[PDB]
Design a protein around this ligand. Structure first.
Ligand SMILES: CC(C)CCC[C@@H](C)[C@H]1CC[C@H]2[C@@H]3CC=C4C[C@@H](OC(=O)CCC(=O)O)CC[C@]4(C)[C@H]3CC[C@]12C
Ligand SMILES: CC(C)CCC[C@@H](C)[C@H]1CC[C@H]2[C@@H]3CC=C4C[C@@H](OC(=O)CCC(=O)O)CC[C@]4(C)[C@H]3CC[C@]12C
Ligand SMILES: CC(C)CCC[C@@H](C)[C@H]1CC[C@H]2[C@@H]3CC=C4C[C@@H](OC(=O)CCC(=O)O)CC[C@]4(C)[C@H]3CC[C@]12C
Ligand SMILES: CC(C)CCC[C@@H](C)[C@H]1CC[C@H]2[C@@H]3CC=C4C[C@@H](OC(=O)CCC(=O)O)CC[C@]4(C)[C@H]3CC[C@]12C
Ligand SMILES: CC(C)CCC[C@@H](C)[C@H]1CC[C@H]2[C@@H]3CC=C4C[C@@H](OC(=O)CCC(=O)O)CC[C@]4(C)[C@H]3CC[C@]12C
Ligand SMILES: CC(C)CCC[C@@H](C)[C@H]1CC[C@H]2[C@@H]3CC=C4C[C@@H](OC(=O)CCC(=O)O)CC[C@]4(C)[C@H]3CC[C@]12C
Ligand SMILES: [K+]
Ligand SMILES: [K+]
Lengths: 242, 242
């Protein structure tokens, strides 16, 4: 029947894509990982030989450094830090902040995510629909002053996504002193709800407590990018759902 | 009009929820963060005084330890590691694997996510719909052998979610030697597409290369949990979309 055939066809393509991606990633990163591992030991062996660090005390230093990594960025559990953590939790980003060490805190975070994810999803969907309607109205007005097809809507949405990504990359490069490609990759990771791209904002020189304007701009940009992504998904992906 | 009223009403509730969550998180974690910071310095100050570590060379040790953290789990860019990374990328988890250090690799990952996210979403939606249909058929057969309402479907879905979460928590506690609550929290984080909860599996004693059965079971459990979550979202959340 149609349902079973569709499901079986969908399963196979995903597995094939997974295999292809895994093979390409392995073939592209095996040598780099080997070189990085070789360099890092050599360096750690040299420094341990120079400083005569005992094996037993070496693990304690690693644990202390790993546990103190979030604390380097300042006080992450302030009002701004808590707001950023809540934003990441509700938007299913889940990176940049430090996981709470309290069982009650973990339970509260679980309940918060459960009660907040559908609301955020519905709000994003509604705002994306409103943005799509506004874009359609603007296109109709432009055509009248100078019948809209989908392809035009798809092209407009893609151009808007590219422009937003470029603007965010430029802003983050000017603020975080990052490369243009690295800033673009970080913006893409943030807007795709992945969360981890080996980069994080609002974690340098205590920017969470001394630059409220930067935090507000980052939050507004994140919200705008998420709304644009949701609108694009509604335009191109949601038709194939039901 | 209805559209604008809905759009403006959703935003206010979302902002109020964000403020409440941030306030609660701050009030619950400020003291814990302060105590952890105090303990970690005291320890680092004591160890630096004991070993007489120079300030200039201290940063190099931190950089080496931070860069070598993924490498401590073995060769992460093998076939199993690449498959795990691809699974995390397509499922918008984005945690458990080190980010690639190559610009070409980053571009390939971006293209992979772009071309794979809608396909995975559609496959999950279709499989969740099939699971919902099968559950409805089973409930109808049970009622006949011993007219189904929604509330019954919602209760059945919630019970299935709780059972799957408990089974996953028990399995991870028996395998990863974690606490029951910690395993439950990790399973909830994984199934909610958050990704980071300070707990990561398949990263101990090289389990990615010596326990293929464990990796296969973990992948199957992740897929089953994601399918169940998608089915629940279709049952309760998707009606309010369109
Ligand atoms: C077991 C767990 C997953 C339950 C999760 C609860 C959700 C199913 C609830 C909680 C908050 C609810 C929302 C709270 C507020 C609103 C605004 C409400 O808007 C109006 O009443 C005015 C506009 C209109 O008429 O639609 C529409 C429903 C909605 C999105 C609700 C939809 C259903 C939500 C997401
Ligand atoms: C027609 C449309 C598409 C253009 C959109 C306007 C942007 C080009 C503007 C609007 C908001 C601006 C941002 C508002 C606030 C800031 C913080 C500002 O930070 C500081 O001044 C302190 C840090 C430092 O010293 O650089 C740096 C510029 C930036 C990112 C601005 C960069 C330019 C932005 C993105
Ligand atoms: C038309 C709609 C989209 C308007 C939405 C309003 C936002 C522009 C406002 C409403 C609440 C504001 C936030 C309320 C509280 C704070 C805490 C504030 O932190 C501090 O003042 C202390 C730390 C520091 O100094 O940065 C930083 C800005 C921020 C995140 C604000 C950023 C801008 C927000 C999101
Ligand atoms: C600019 C970016 C966002 C483009 C993203 C591409 C997607 C819009 C495409 C890529 C893969 C496509 C899917 C590839 C395979 C199929 C199986 C296909 O199933 C059948 O042909 C049999 C069942 C039936 O008759 O519907 C239905 C469409 C679907 C889900 C496609 C829907 C549209 C997808 C997600
Ligand atoms: C009726 C339904 C609801 C029950 C579903 C059956 C589960 C209780 C079974 C099915 C698959 C089983 C798993 C299959 C494989 C493994 C790997 C296995 O690992 C090893 O044997 C090596 C590691 C070690 O030494 O413990 C540990 C048990 C576990 C998690 C099993 C635990 C019990 C599971 C989840
Ligand atoms: C009805 C449907 C859901 C069936 C789906 C099939 C899966 C049960 C199979 C198909 C491909 C399999 C994977 C193919 C390749 C590998 C690599 C394999 O790794 C190795 O053999 C080397 C490393 C090690 O020793 O673990 C570990 C299992 C895994 C992930 C397999 C896990 C089980 C998978 C996902
Ligand atoms: K995520
Ligand atoms: K996500």
């Amino acid at each position: 029947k149609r349902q079973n055939v569709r499901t079986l066809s969908l399963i196979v393509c995903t597995f094939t894509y997974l295999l292809v991606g895994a093979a390409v990633f392995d073939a592209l990163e095996s040598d780099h990982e080997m070189r990085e591992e070789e360099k890092l030991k050599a360096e750690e062996i040299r420094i341990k030989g120079k400083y005569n660090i005992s094996s037993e005390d070496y693990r304690q230093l690693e644990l202390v450094i790993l546990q103190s990594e979030p604390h380097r960025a300042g006080v992450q559990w302030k009002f701004a830090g808590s707001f950023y953590f809540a934003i990441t939790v509700i938007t299913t980003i889940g990176y940049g902040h430090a996981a709470p060490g309290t069982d009650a805190g973990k339970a509260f975070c679980m309940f918060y995510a459960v009660l907040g994810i559908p609301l955020t999803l519905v709000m994003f969907q509604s705002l994306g629909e409103r943005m799509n309607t506004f874009v359609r109205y603007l296109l109709k007005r432009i055509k009248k002053c100078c019948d809209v097809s989908m392809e035009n809507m798809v092209t407009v949405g893609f151009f808007s996504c590219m422009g937003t990504l470029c603007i965010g990359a430029a802003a983050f490069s000017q603020c975080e002193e990052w490369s243009f490609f690295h800033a673009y990759y970080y913006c893409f990771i943030t807007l795709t709800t992945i969360g981890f791209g080996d980069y994080v904002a609002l974690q340098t020189k205590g920017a969470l407590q001394k630059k409220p304007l930067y935090v507000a701009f980052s939050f507004m940009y994140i919200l705008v990018g998420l709304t644009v992504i949701g609108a694009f998904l509604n335009l191109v992906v949601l038709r194939f759902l039901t």
